[PDB]
């Protein structure tokens, strides 16, 4: 189907407590597969999915080199950003970067990404053309000018169109047992009284992969969006996800309510009701 690969990076300065903490993880779709944490003893990038473990020692050596260089680049960049925002060296600040690519079912590039944020806000982002930039403020315009002079967009475009897609396709083949398997949600409806007059109907979806899912409650066939409590989809810890949606219904009208489940793992969408 469609698929993605992303590398996420965070540096957090901690003045008076040594160098910034640096953590990066890589994902294919919703599957974590590599990690690097600067505060580990002798830090190396480590595998987190079985299908990456077969990469040879040269692969881990080059990945670790990249992780360490990015940490060091972030350390300098955090000092730069203190100048650009006229900030003190006393406080803790955050630099985040994400990049990666999306491919379609034929394995063709759909979209590439590379974006940076400072202290939780947009700083500078490569546009979807992979050739121009969006700078969020006059500080990021300085970076933009530097990155235009240096033709950074062209270098990123070459990676996103080439290696990014090539390697994602390799990962997809090598982990096809799990990466190309959708686990449908296991579903049920629970009923919990809140008084003599109403009760919560809660529609559960457990054990599913990938995380994308739609849960909706209807009453007599009409969506209950404004009446529906819907928790963020959350990780089970074993690669799969969980979600639920709830509505408060008048006691005795439970059979008017249906829960609708759409998931890539499902033959067809499900319709569930509370079953006493």
């Amino acid at each position: 189907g469609s698929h993605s690969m992303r590398y996420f990076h965070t540096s957090v300065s901690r003045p008076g407590r040594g160098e910034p903490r640096f953590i990066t993880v890589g994902y294919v779709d919703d599957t974590l597969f590599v990690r690097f944490d600067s505060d580990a003893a002798s830090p190396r990038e480590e595998p987190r999915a079985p299908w990456i473990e077969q990469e040879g020692p040269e692969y881990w050596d080059r990945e670790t080199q990249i992780c360490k260089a990015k940490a060091q680049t972030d350390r300098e960049d955090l000092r730069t950003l203190l100048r650009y925002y006229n900030q003190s060296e006393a406080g803790s600040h955050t630099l985040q970067n994400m990049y990666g690519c999306d491919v379609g079912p034929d394995g063709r590039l759909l979209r590439g990404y590379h974006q940076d944020a400072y202290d939780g806000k947009d700083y500078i982002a490569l546009n979807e053309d992979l050739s121009s930039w969006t700078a969020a403020d006059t500080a990021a315009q300085i970076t933009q000018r530097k990155w235009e002079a240096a033709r950074v967009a062209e270098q990123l475009r070459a990676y996103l169109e080439g290696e990014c897609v090539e390697w994602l396709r390799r990962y997809l083949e090598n982990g096809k047992e799990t990466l190309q398997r959708a686990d449908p949600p296991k579903t049920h409806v629970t009923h919990h009284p809140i008084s003599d007059h109403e009760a919560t109907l809660r529609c559960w979806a457990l054990g599913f992969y990938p995380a994308e899912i739609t849960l909706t409650w209807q009453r007599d066939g009409e969506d209950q969006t404004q009446d529906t409590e819907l928790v963020e989809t959350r990780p089970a810890g074993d690669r799969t996800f969980q979600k639920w949606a709830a509505v408060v219904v008048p006691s005795g009208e439970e059979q008017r309510y249906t829960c609708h489940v759409q998931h890539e793992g499902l033959p067809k969408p499900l319709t569930l009701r509370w079953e006493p």
Partner: peptide, 9 residues
């Protein structure tokens, strides 16, 4: 696999 970052802010 990763892309080496060769640029500064």
């Amino acid at each position: 696999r990763r892309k080496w970052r060769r640029w500064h802010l």
